[PDB]
Symmetry: D2
Subunit: 359 residues, 4 copies
Amino acid sequence: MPIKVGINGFGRIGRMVFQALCEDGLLGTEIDVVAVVDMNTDAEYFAYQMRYDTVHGKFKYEVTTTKSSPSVAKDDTLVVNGHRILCVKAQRNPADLPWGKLGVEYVIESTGLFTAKAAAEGHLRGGARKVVISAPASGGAKTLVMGVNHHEYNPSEHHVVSNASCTTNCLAPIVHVLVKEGFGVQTGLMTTIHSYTATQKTVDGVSVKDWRGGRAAAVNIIPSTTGAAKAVGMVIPSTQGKLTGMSFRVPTPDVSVVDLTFTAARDTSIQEIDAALKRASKTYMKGILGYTDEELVSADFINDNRSSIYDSKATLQNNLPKERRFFKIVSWYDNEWGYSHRVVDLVRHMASKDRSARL
Amino acid sequence: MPIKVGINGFGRIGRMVFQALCEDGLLGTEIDVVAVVDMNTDAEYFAYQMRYDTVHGKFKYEVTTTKSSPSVAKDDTLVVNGHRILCVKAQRNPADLPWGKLGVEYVIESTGLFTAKAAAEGHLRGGARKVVISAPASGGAKTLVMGVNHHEYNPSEHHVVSNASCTTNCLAPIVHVLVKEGFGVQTGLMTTIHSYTATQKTVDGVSVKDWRGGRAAAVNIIPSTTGAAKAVGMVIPSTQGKLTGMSFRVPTPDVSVVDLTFTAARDTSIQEIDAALKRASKTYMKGILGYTDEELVSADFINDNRSSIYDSKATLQNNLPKERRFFKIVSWYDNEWGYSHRVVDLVRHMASKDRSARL
Amino acid sequence: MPIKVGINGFGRIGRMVFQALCEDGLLGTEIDVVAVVDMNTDAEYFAYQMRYDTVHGKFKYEVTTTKSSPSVAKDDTLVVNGHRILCVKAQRNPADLPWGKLGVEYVIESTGLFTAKAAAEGHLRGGARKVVISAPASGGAKTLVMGVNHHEYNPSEHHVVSNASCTTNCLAPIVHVLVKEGFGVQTGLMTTIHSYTATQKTVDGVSVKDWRGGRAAAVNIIPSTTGAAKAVGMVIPSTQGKLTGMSFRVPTPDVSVVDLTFTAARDTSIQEIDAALKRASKTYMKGILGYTDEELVSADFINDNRSSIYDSKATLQNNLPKERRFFKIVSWYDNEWGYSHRVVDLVRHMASKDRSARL
Amino acid sequence: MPIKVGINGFGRIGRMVFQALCEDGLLGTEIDVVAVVDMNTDAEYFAYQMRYDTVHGKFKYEVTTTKSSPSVAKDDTLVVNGHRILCVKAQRNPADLPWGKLGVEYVIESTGLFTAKAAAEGHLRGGARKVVISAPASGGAKTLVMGVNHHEYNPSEHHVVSNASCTTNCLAPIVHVLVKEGFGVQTGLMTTIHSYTATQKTVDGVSVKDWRGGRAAAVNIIPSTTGAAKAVGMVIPSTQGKLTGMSFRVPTPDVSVVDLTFTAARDTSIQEIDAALKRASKTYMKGILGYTDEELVSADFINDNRSSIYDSKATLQNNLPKERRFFKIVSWYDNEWGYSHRVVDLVRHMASKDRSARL
Ligand SMILES: NC(=O)c1ccc[n+]([C@@H]2O[C@H](COP(=O)([O-])OP(=O)(O)OC[C@H]3O[C@@H](n4cnc5c(N)ncnc54)[C@H](O)[C@@H]3O)[C@@H](O)[C@H]2O)c1
Ligand SMILES: NC(=O)c1ccc[n+]([C@@H]2O[C@H](COP(=O)([O-])OP(=O)(O)OC[C@H]3O[C@@H](n4cnc5c(N)ncnc54)[C@H](O)[C@@H]3O)[C@@H](O)[C@H]2O)c1
Ligand SMILES: NC(=O)c1ccc[n+]([C@@H]2O[C@H](COP(=O)([O-])OP(=O)(O)OC[C@H]3O[C@@H](n4cnc5c(N)ncnc54)[C@H](O)[C@@H]3O)[C@@H](O)[C@H]2O)c1
Ligand SMILES: *C(=O)C(=C)CCP(=O)(O)O
Ligand SMILES: *C(=O)C(=C)CCP(=O)(O)O
Ligand SMILES: *C(=O)C(=C)CCP(=O)(O)O
């Protein structure tokens, strides 16, 4: 019994999540992506967008389009591995989405227009049973980070949840190892050298909610506030109020890195931390936290499925010698790729626990 | 008193058109910028946007703000060395703007939303007497290129006109010299290696009307159709149907280059052509057509106010020796700066003609 | 039966050629890269340079290192998928290389510092027999272009050949089709919007031989002269003195595009030419000349091993309607990748016309 | 009378120093560049590089060229705004330079190859009474940072000094105010988001002594160690062993920013720290340390001559609320412009103390 899934908003964020799901080999097997709602319904265009990608290369599977019924001008259905995905048109209120009629049980909310728990809940009225906001959320939606606290998902209590942000999914795994291994965190500050994104502008333009963010993205280092570090406190309560940080948007299309500076809760050493991080990578954090000890640069992390990738050499080479509390930890993350898989990983976990709850 | 002007759409062109005004010592004497309209009326933001430009440097003149009336919450007025500009709130429809209440006789239309003559005439209903669309128009609006056919402005017939595009303003001057000097243009094709603009995207995004135009701007050479070359047959009638061309959007925030290939109407040489352009540059095309014979690159043309800078060295070193018909002409232009000065020149020319006609 | 090859100058093209050779699965079966010579001998550093590529992704095969003999300090042997390559030291003079000791006949010259057929001939008196210059050659060295004139190879007359340039390899196939098809070419000028290369500078720097080429590469559009067009005349004598052109280095790491403007030797149509290029691609030019009809941009050609990919839409949409002589043809090419595969395709041709023609 | 100066190594930094020297209007009156020795003699080329800059705009002073004496073959003299500057040929040893013959007492060592105190000594044997190394130096050379410890310059003891690096000139002022204002530094880690430099490469190349540094510069976030932090321990001894940090080279041609994270020596608040830095920039750090409180990005610091420009908004908005020990401070710098002005400043300072010590 495959999972009936619907993706609300088939923008750049939605596609990656769908491509993620495909590469893992879940389409038509584990997950039945029934539909994808969006303001556009030209499947031929959606096929072109999946087929090519400036940063992630060419799609692994062939993509064809077709009509849902002979009585349709331009194709309105996506085809991948014989799996048919219907392209539905956007709706003002999520409650008006044909979710029930479509049989969609799990809807991936990625429009960025419904990050408020209450709003995202509309999908439920529209017939959905569970929603995953593919970004930070307000209103009190349960926030879950794979590999950190996803086992806290409660089928009967959590119907609208958030998979947090791509940056939190990079930082949290590092902090989670520190708090779980006993190094602990007294206070911390994080900085993320972040690739520019879709909200930024090519040339200087109007951006009322963030003036710096309206400046030419590919030719500027653009400072920015962020809530990713504070959010780690929701996934790991013991760090609430002890962490925060910023972001520097730099001229790269994809891939970012985490620069965490913190004071451990007890004497330790950078080598001791290096070992703990590596060890966790091969054990309880496998698939979520990985590491590298080669001379890598941002391009070498394009398409890496891990949420966080510890940079051993950079860490070990840039810490105070013989220091026991004040440390720096560098960890990479393909902001688009890692997160997209986490979103899929989370839907499968939820489905799994919802399933075992009806026995 | 000075010409009362209003700027609808304070973006790249609106602001650079303004810089041109201040720079040339026209503000308060020849031209009076009564107001500027954009998404908000928050002068502080307008000031910040004018004060700093990532490609054209810091505004050399001091900009401050004030309120039009204490009954106002936030400052809504810009002050540039004692000159006051009211920040009017954007209107979906031009006819709604308070041009009348402001005494605006000339309005620069630079939002990129009302390039249709019919839509632009909304400003006249608002109390404006003339309008210059800072882009190619449709609906039968007269098109004018300073240095080429601007003396075709008919005070009592043309009320809503178009100052063409940046590319046409770079091309036309060249073709005009070719036709006037008697070399002639039998057939021609041009390619413009163009800098990205506000219409493009930072990361692969949605662009139903121009699929290629939706791909990441600063990491792709993006082909694109353009009417710039065809529009020349609308300014230089004898070229109608003989020219056209394409564009290649590349990773630079500003400055572009026209690469024109053509067959002359008679036997010549690239040397004779070189001489003529240089000559016109120093004479009847001065101010509009300039030239360089140095090893310059795009950044070297940032802030050049001519409409076309003939690149002599590049032209002379890349043509068929002894050829007498098939030629290539390379010419640069600061797509933002040059064109913005042209808009101002156009308004001033219209204001003098208008006075003459009312004698 | 495994041949014998030796790459001199293991840089971008050297590694791209070696990688190309592996991609086609020739490492061991048909080709056997005996050894490679470059700057240092740090086998560890070579492998790292092979594992990761900023634009071409991560290498397909697994790479590791060992020692040719315990007698040597650091490693000096690559173990790509099993094969064993030796990192012989590089000499300032090609003659000083021990190609005889290792017995290497076919030596890929990719250092980019030995163009003269005399200097790049030292490989012969150094032990090697046949030498291939991965770049335009001088001193009268036979120039060959797969799909165009590579059959003009004389086993006993040609011992130091050239594979031409990336650009020549992209332009030639188009010209070839045009000529061979009967359209013919009276005159033609070509412009290539080209990505920056290793010879350029990250920031404005010294470059006596080419001032423009000395300016900041990733932020400027830089003009340059090129021989590519004239070079075609050497490969298709029918066009000698009929073609020339220039380049424009733009802010992209790889992938370029040719923009050819020409007058046919007879009356035709852009449609009749479009059809022939497509036909030639599927037939006698397959593998050398490809084509697309989708909304592609530079990034979409990354890793395309065709020498020239004709852009049907960019072409059919940008030519003069009803024209029959003056035309514009657009064709792409991964300057690093395509040329690399051609180098292998050539080295293999220079072998099949030896073991089947004299053995 | 005017300070007779010489600039060994007229590379980019050598040029920036000269332009800065001119920008301060010191050329001819308060300092005269007798000559500028470099590996190249092509004065015309010198005039070209000085005339245009892809990031700093066009030179505000006219530069022409002539011969020192009709007997001289090519032009060997640069004529700047009137002042005459000779282009001497480079030597293998400073002592071989005509410094004394020319009457050059202060030589600006910026060839980057005479870093060693002993090496840089040769200039003294040649006649020069003082040498300033425009970069970190070794061999027991006095390191001086304007506004921080330049008053530690000993006329008769320090004849060969270092002006440190761009980064140290940004961090030092910040730390200096922290220490001088009574906050103190217990421990500190610094991260600099740094724009690429001349030693990096356009495409993946060879960097035997820095694998990451060899990767494509304008398309990667490239990690890197740095001495700036530790180097501060020379200027401000109390911090020795307390500070260290790294670097992240990003896709920008110029302008960088320091991200400092530290623990104060006493309890404070970010407000208190913020107020102090501002007060200091307005007083004893005037000209060296500046601050901003506007929404600025990298482009806005281009041509800023301060050594460090504190970012108040970014600092205040990104620190732990109510924190009293663990803080983060953000400060910008035009790694090319600021440092170039400091160099000039150091020479002017020395020249001053040297004379007052013998009056
Ligand atoms: N930038 C160039 O190189 C260039 C050169 C020549 C001509 N043009 C033309 O100028 C026009 C504007 O181009 P741009 O580069 O300045 O783009 P831009 O996006 O920078 O400027 C457009 C501005 O209009 C504002 N706006 C949007 N809707 C509005 C409304 N209803 N009322 C008032 N303001 C509104 C936007 O906030 C924006 O600031 C376009 O038509 C373009 O084709 C651009
Ligand atoms: N990359 C391209 O776009 C391209 C495409 C086709 C042909 N080519 C031609 O290939 C040649 C090299 O181009 P590239 O892009 O690979 O440049 P590159 O700089 O990346 O490669 C050249 C390599 O040779 C090494 N080298 C220098 N002197 C050497 C010596 N004496 N012995 C051994 N190695 C030495 C350099 O360290 C460098 O790694 C040039 O002739 C170029 O015209 C380049
Ligand atoms: N560019 C910056 O951001 C910057 C800022 C501050 C300090 N520095 C320091 O400056 C030095 C390099 O300056 P750059 O970054 O401007 O590099 P650059 O490559 O632009 O300058 C090097 C110049 O030195 C010339 N040169 C080399 N050896 C020479 C010799 N023997 N005689 C004469 N000329 C010679 C070269 O021709 C070249 O023009 C390094 O020590 C660097 O740490 C650089
Ligand atoms: C000049 O830059 C132009 C008018 C290009 C078209 P647009 O994208 O509208 O700026
Ligand atoms: C291939 O040969 C290239 C690296 C392009 C050289 P050019 O045609 O001069 O841009
Ligand atoms: C300032 O940018 C530095 C710390 C030195 C730059 P470079 O020596 O070119 O790496």
